[PDB]
Design a binder for this molecule. Sequence first.
Ligand code: NI
Ligand code: NI
Ligand code: NI
Ligand code: NI
Ligand SMILES: [O-]
Ligand SMILES: [O-]
Lengths: 570, 570, 122, 100, 100, 100
Amino acid sequence: MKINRQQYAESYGPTVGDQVRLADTDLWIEVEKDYTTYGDEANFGGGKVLREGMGENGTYTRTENVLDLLLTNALILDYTGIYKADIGVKDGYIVGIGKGGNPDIMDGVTPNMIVGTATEVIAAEGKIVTAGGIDTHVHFINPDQVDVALANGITTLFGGGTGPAEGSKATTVTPGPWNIEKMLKSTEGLPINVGILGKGHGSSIAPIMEQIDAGAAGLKIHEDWGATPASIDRSLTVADEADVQVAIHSDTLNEAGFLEDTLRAINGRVIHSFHVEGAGGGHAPDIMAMAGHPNVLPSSTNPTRPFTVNTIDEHLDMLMVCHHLKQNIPEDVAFADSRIRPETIAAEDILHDLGIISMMSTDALAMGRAGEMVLRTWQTADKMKKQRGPLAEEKNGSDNFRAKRYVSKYTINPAIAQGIAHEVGSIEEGKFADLVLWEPKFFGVKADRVIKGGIIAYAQIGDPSASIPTPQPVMGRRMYGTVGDLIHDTNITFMSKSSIQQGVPAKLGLKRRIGTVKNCRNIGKKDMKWNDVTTDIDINPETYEVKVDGEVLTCEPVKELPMAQRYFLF
Amino acid sequence: MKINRQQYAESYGPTVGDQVRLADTDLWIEVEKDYTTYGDEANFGGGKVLREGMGENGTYTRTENVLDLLLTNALILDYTGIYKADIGVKDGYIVGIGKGGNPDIMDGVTPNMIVGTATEVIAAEGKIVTAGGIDTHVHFINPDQVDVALANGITTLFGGGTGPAEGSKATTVTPGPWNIEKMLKSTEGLPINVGILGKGHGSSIAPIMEQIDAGAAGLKIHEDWGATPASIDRSLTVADEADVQVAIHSDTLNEAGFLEDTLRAINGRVIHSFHVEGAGGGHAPDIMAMAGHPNVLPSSTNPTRPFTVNTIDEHLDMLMVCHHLKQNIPEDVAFADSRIRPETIAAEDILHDLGIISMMSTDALAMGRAGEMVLRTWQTADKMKKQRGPLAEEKNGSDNFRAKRYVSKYTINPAIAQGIAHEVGSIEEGKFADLVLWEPKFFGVKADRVIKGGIIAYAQIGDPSASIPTPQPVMGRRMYGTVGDLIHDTNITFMSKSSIQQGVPAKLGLKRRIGTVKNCRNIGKKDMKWNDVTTDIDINPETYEVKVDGEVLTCEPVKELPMAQRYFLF
Amino acid sequence: NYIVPGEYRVAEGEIEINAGREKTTIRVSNTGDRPIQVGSHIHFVEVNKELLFDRAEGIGRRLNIPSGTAARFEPGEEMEVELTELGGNREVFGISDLTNGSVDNKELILQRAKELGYKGVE
Amino acid sequence: MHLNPAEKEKLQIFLASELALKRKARGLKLNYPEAVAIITSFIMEGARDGKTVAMLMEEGKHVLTRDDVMEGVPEMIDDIQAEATFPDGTKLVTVHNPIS
Amino acid sequence: MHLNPAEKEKLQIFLASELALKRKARGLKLNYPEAVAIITSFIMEGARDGKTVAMLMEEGKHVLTRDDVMEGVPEMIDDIQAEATFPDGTKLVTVHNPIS
Amino acid sequence: MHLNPAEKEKLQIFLASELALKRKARGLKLNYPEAVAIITSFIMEGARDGKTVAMLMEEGKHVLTRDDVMEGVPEMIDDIQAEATFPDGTKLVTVHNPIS
Ligand code: NI
Ligand code: NI
Ligand code: NI
Ligand code: NI
Ligand SMILES: [O-]
Ligand SMILES: [O-]
């Protein structure tokens, strides 16, 4: 028997050569390869394949190559490829990507992907499956921000803060041993992976280092605490000793130096440059030149992504109100005009498309939206396809190259930058089972189901009083992975090696999975997947014109975006 | 002095011979007996009886026959009787049913029901008090389902699932040791009693048994996992070894056998037959014949209860959409027509009334409503009184026989079936104090207060900012029994004897009360209270006509029910 | 260029299921008075006793239909079905307990089938 | 009032439908959640009126047409499901392809 | 807006009252929660208008009559209580037997 | 509908604005939360209409005047901020001294 390709894709999801539109964008992803054996596809339900003696093995105990969970027929979108496979989970980790079922009767079964008595099933046919998003610029200001992040497919928050204190409202900082300890204890109740940044400020090593020993996963250098040559230097000395990452929001005011002074203080050491375009902060007007250097891991925050007709009006006003600036004080207007620049925001769109900016992030509740990192990544990719065309490297008419370049910006690249890519950031065997299922019509907009440590944590689901789960109102809801003690097993607290060695988890009574930060100090730009480009970026101090390889980088703002008014009630 | 009966009932609740209407139904319950001493009724408030040196004893310490809690003047509705008594609670258990107060000065005080310094008071005058409902067909799909269940007086959920995974959306199954461990840890946060079912599927004993050792309280055999002769046989061999119950959703498709094949695999062993009418699943069209056998404990799920003019249209459409069936594929229409049958749904109403189906259950979020088990039990009893008349066994014009037959279906019978009736399922001395208070006008519709382990867990209560608790809006709310560590003392996790002996609670850090499942394998139909009838049920394979003792069982669907649009906002 | 959010653009062609495996057509009759529906992946010799067919021709085989679909037999209905070969290790356990091992043990499978009254053991 | 959890939740649907109907009245093409809210609230108000499940399965296909909604919204909505209290208790309504 | 918990909750009462008034406008006899919502919202809007507690105790008995509600609803509602901010601060209104 | 947390929350603003507009219609001077609700809902409905951030910064200063609100309310409201989905995605609107 043969099955026509339309009916095959409707039953099992798409197969090799089939294309899928991402939401209401112009972007198409094409299935590159498929791990299945045609005729032996796994599926679950009445009279379906995953039944005892059939596609479910009735012999093997859980330890004998049997899965805890099989996601059937997933369309994976990952830096590693765009392809069709079953995904096998065991002990909260991805253990197999391939073909699940019963080797008794099926050909092509991946040997550790047996469906047995112990196996739960999630149907992913007709879903796109991605890694959980890794947001590395989070202000911990309002605990309601966690569901916002989960609803847009974010599973890891790296940042700092103590709630709506002015330090935290401005900076991703949890300062000092006591605030760090308190926020590690708060984290026990947050249904998302977390890593905490200490204050990257001081002129003696001991005040900075004692934050790493207390359980910080990294540091933040911020101009509001003094982004001085001394604070930069001492933070990077701590980081090189402790094997944690340092993020920087540089001296916008150029008070103690210009960009070249900050780069001399960095002295070739690895650093994560936050909101590298500079609307979110940094040396006016040329901070974005950081993104050309081999020791810089450069991220954007989301409010400039992508460049739209309301962007400048929105940002200029937001900067003036948040800094208490007066429209009638010429120094205030000059400062705002030096910081919010259409020239660098337009160039930032193109630097993303070229693989020169490696990462996205939110700046959640400080100057960015907790639930729009994934959303704005795809809106940027879609705008760039419209304005620049398919990238030269594309084939078959697909946008696969662009899709891998852009999915890397919020999955694997932040994880590499932070020293946590051994645990999270991609759909690979041996990594934690943080997985997001998307209906293609909602791709990048609203996650269907968010799996944390192999258990559903968050889902779009309906009336809990109904006969079935789909009746209205369908809304984002926390699921059983967030309830009781299961919140401890489905989530990771990322901590420094020293805090782990010194027994901070046992001292504080932390019950969450403990993740080790490591391998942050001997990476660079070349380690950013699909986004590894180093180049001399010139920013004209008079016109704010950005040039790369002698060419001005400019594009127009757009009046409309996809993934916007078709989807949202407000 | 003498008190007229109307004023007596208004002050103290009804006494011997008085009748009370259940909600807006036609059903009347009559007080059979009263434990009080007239003139020495207990009551609490200003100038009332329960005061120091008066109806409250001021001498005795808590250990000296003093209660932690006295429910005064309760109208108990229970399989054991419909009667007026005070209910005494101590250490979270019912310790006395009788007459509370102070033996210093009162006649007739039950000796362990002293009101002392240590005693809290709940006024139950003019309330109906029942046991918490025991729902034995729960899909754990959406944690919001717990409040839904509490609001309709359910206090125990037995079932399975891991949240909105396809396996869980179809089947009451938490598969394998790891998913079971994870859901036991989730249970620590759910403010209701819980027992978890493992997957009753496999051809070797070890994969099935290792779920019981991990902390499952029972098994579920479901056609979607292969309800084969082998899976049935191995599950019942495990169950007989482990002393846990097995629930079955049989092979609707008759793929590996007909009903007689499933009964031969069961081989006289005890089994709980879920949704025995068969709309919810099972051998088409004759599964309901299971309910005639002495080794079968038969339950209904709630969507067919009772038979109404919208039932068939609703079910046929629900089955087609949930199974992805096409109205233009003749095999799909034939399957639906073979499964949704007015002939068996109408007969199911009468089999409940005759005591041939012993239990109700929800099928919460799979094909049934988490908050309507109690509701639909009484709507069925009311429809049967209207269509069949008072049962022959009634006296005094009351519906007491019917009320005891029907309250048994969602209290004591599920508890007996599951092996948990030593702890829960009835208002008896020595059982856990899971008690539901109902205003008669809301009886079976909306619980007033739900007591879990002797502390209020859930209540219909008003504005928390008000001077008093009754101002609007009055809505269902979680109470202090659900907050902090008290959730551990007010709720039971039911587990297998082996998992308890192997120290699973200590291994997982479970803090909840641990209940032992036992005495499930040497019961039968004769052990179902008020619902113990065995008979040859014939289901005509051509007309789907049900006959018992040579008589066709049929009734009309109704256009209206009580306990419906008078009460609900939607 | 009307946009259907999340739409597919499937490639040209057709998917051949169970490619390169032997196919077999047999006649099967539902001798019972209730419908029987048989899924794609049940070992065909182990189906409902009241299905009458050459049971030997079901050994080591299943229906050649798309994964997750089923063949329906109304009461009294006789029709032809196409079978394909089981793959992997060609072992079956459980189901009706006729095989519990290699599907190559034809003699033992049919002896069990005949003793338990599976129709069509020839 | 004695609201249960579902009654509290379903007030949101009514509210979203009122919001969407105001947007339609000032001449906007409706989006995906607006359209779903309007059709869902219509079903629950129909049940309250005492219509049958069959009447609402029919009527729900004629509440909004293609020219009431943005491009792609008809194809995004495969079916709208709602439970409400009919005169004969809670029932499930499914409206198939409500916007053709 | 600086909403406190009670302000958030009491928006639900207003919303339920709007729902109930729409149902009454299309000719339905109102049920128990509908009737309670309408009378409760009337009390809180009266306080907002600057009426006295005594005025609302009187007026609340004339908002709905027997022929506005289903059989048995008058006898189910013994009293409706609401707190609202009067010109002289929060006060409790109780309306006794509002539907006679 | 697939509501996210912000969509659920912002329905409250619409509801509070409807409540406040009913109070203004029966002749009341509006209070601080009423005024904030009305101006906030105006901004989010304007975004839905496809107005620019600049248009709403202008219009938001003319929704309510001094004689629509109680004494001191104009001086209590220094600025009203709202985020909504414009045709070009979520943007922040700040209205400075909306009631002069
Ligand atoms: Ni910054
Ligand atoms: Ni920041
Ligand atoms: Ni079932
Ligand atoms: Ni079920
Ligand atoms: O920032
Ligand atoms: O079920």
